[PDB]
XYZ file of N, CA, C and O in Angstrom:
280
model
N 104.855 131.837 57.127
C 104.325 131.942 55.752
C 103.374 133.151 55.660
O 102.219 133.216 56.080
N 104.346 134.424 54.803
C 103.056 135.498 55.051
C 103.418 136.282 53.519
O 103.297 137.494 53.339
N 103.887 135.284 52.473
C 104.280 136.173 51.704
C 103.976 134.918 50.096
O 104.324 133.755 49.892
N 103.037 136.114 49.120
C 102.815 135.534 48.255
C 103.983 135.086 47.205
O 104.846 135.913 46.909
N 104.005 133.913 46.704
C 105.111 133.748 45.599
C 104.733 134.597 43.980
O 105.541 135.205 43.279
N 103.839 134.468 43.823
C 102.941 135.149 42.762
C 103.053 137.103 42.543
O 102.081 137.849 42.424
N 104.040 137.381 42.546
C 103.917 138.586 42.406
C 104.083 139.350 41.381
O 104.471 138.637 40.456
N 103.977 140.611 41.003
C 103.851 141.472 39.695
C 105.135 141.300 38.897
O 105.335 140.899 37.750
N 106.160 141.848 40.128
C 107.631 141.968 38.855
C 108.178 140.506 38.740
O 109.406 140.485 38.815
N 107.532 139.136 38.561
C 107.914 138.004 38.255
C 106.819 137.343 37.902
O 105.850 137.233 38.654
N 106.896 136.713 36.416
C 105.413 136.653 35.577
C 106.058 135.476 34.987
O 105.203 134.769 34.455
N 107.553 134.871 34.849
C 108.540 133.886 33.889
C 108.146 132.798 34.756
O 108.017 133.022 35.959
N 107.941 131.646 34.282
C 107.378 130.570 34.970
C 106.538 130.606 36.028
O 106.330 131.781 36.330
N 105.830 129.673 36.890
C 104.393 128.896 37.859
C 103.687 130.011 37.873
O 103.443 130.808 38.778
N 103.234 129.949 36.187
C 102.240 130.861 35.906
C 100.708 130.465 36.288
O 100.817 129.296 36.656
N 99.375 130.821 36.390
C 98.396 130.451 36.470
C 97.258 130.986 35.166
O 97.246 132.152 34.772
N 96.639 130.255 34.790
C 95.287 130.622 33.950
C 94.156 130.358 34.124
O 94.139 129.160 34.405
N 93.067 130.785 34.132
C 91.594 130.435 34.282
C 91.003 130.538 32.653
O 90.940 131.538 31.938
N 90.650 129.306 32.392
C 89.609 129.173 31.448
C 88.274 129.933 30.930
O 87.127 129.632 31.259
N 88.705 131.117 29.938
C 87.404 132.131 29.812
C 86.512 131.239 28.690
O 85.293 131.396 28.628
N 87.151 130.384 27.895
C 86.556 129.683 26.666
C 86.494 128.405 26.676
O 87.293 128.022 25.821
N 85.847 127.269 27.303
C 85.951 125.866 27.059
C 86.717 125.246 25.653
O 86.733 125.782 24.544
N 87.035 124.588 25.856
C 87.930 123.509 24.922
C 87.849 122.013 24.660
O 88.850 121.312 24.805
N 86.841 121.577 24.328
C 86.669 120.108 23.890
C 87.681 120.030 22.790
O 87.630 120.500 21.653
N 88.258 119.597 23.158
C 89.805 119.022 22.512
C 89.815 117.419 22.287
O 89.627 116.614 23.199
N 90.155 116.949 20.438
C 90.140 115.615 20.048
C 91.188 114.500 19.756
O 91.131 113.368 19.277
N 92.527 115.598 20.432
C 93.365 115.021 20.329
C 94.127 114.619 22.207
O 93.633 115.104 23.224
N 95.212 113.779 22.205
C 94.861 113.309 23.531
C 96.452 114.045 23.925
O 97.183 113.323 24.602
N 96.860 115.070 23.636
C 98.311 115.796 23.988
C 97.349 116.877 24.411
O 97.583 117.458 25.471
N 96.186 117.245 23.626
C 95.552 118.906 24.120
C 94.321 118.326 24.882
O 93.383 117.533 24.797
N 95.172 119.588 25.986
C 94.068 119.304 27.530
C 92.583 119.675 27.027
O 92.510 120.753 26.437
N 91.527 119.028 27.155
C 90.353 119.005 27.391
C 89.963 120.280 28.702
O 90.762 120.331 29.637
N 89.024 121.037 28.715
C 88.269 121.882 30.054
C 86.966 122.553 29.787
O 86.345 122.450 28.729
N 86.573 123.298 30.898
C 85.401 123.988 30.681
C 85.698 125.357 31.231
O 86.859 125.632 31.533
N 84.801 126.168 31.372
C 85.051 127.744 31.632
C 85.171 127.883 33.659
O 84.259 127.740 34.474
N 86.154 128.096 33.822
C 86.712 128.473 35.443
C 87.627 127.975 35.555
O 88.391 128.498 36.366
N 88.215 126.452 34.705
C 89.559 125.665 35.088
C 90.867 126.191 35.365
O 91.640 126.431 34.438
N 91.070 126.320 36.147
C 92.852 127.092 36.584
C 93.466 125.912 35.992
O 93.055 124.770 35.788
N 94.921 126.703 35.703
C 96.165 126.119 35.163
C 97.463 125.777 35.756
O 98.248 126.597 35.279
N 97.904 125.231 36.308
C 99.217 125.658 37.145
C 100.678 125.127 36.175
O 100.918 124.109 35.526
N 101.393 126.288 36.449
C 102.577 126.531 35.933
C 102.177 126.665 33.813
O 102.243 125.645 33.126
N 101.813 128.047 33.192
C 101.385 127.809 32.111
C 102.565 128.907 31.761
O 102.818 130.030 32.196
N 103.345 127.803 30.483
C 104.384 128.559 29.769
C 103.708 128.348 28.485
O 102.738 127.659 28.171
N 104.343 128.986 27.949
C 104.342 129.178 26.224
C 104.670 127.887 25.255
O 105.866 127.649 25.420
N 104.038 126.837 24.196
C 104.286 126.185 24.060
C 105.082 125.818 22.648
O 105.149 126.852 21.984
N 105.585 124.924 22.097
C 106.722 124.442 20.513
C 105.354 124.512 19.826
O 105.638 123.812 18.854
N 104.149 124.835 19.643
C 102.924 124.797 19.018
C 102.446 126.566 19.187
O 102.215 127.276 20.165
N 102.448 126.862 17.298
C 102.198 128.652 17.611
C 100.693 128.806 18.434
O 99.690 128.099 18.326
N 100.832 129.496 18.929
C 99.589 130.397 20.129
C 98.486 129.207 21.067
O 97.265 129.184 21.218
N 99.793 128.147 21.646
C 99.548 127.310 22.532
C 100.023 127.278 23.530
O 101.087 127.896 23.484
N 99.778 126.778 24.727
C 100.348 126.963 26.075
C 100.503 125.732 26.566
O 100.015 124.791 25.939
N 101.284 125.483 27.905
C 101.635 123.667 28.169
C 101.399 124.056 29.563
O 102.154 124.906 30.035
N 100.460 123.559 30.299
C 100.305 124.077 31.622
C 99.593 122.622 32.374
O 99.027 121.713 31.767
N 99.807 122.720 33.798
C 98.867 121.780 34.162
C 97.771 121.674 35.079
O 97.703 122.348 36.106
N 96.691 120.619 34.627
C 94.956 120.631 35.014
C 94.834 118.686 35.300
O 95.213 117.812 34.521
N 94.357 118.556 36.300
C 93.858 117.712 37.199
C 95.297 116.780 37.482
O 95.281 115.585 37.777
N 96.268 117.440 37.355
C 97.670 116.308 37.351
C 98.275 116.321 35.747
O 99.228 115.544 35.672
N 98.011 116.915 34.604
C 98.257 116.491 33.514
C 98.748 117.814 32.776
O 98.001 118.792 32.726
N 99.996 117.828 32.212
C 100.345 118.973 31.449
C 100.029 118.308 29.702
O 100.210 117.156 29.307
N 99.361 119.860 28.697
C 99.381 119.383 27.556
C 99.006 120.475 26.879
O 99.029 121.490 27.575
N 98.601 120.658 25.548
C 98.276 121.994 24.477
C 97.066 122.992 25.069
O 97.078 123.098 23.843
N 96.363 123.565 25.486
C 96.245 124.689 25.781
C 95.690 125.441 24.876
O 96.572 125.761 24.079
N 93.973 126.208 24.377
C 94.501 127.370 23.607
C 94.632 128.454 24.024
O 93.598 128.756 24.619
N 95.728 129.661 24.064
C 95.970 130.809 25.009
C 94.856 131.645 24.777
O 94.574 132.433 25.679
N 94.095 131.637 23.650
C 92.582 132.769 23.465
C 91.607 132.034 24.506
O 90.620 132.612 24.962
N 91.991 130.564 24.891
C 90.644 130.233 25.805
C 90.998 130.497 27.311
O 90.167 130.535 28.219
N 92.324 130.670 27.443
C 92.698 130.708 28.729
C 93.449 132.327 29.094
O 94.279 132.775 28.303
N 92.994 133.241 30.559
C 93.074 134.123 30.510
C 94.293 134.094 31.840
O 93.858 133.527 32.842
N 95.503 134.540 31.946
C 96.457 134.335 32.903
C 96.081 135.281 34.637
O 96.240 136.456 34.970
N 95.807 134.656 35.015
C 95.628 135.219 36.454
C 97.209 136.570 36.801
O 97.295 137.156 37.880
């Protein structure tokens, strides 16, 4: 094992994001976080300028202005 999966010319799916903007979120489909939370696997979501990614075990809405893609 000496080779990253994460590389430049492949960005289409097991994307990652870090949280630049917290999100207290009141609905229970959009993930709740605070500012540093990574994302694993964050695609584009059926909701305009939302993302579906997942945080502590749980995929759900996302806002892409709060989250910055590694």
């Amino acid at each position: 094992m000496g080779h990253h999966h994460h590389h430049h010319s492949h960005m289409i799916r097991s994307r990652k994001a870090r949280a630049v903007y917290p999100c207290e979120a009141e609905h229970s489909s959009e993930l709740s976080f605070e500012i540093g939370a990574i994302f694993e696997d964050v695609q584009t979501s059926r909701e305009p300028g939302w993302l579906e990614g997942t945080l502590n075990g749980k995929r759900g809405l996302i806002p892409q202005n709060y989250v910055k893609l590694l």
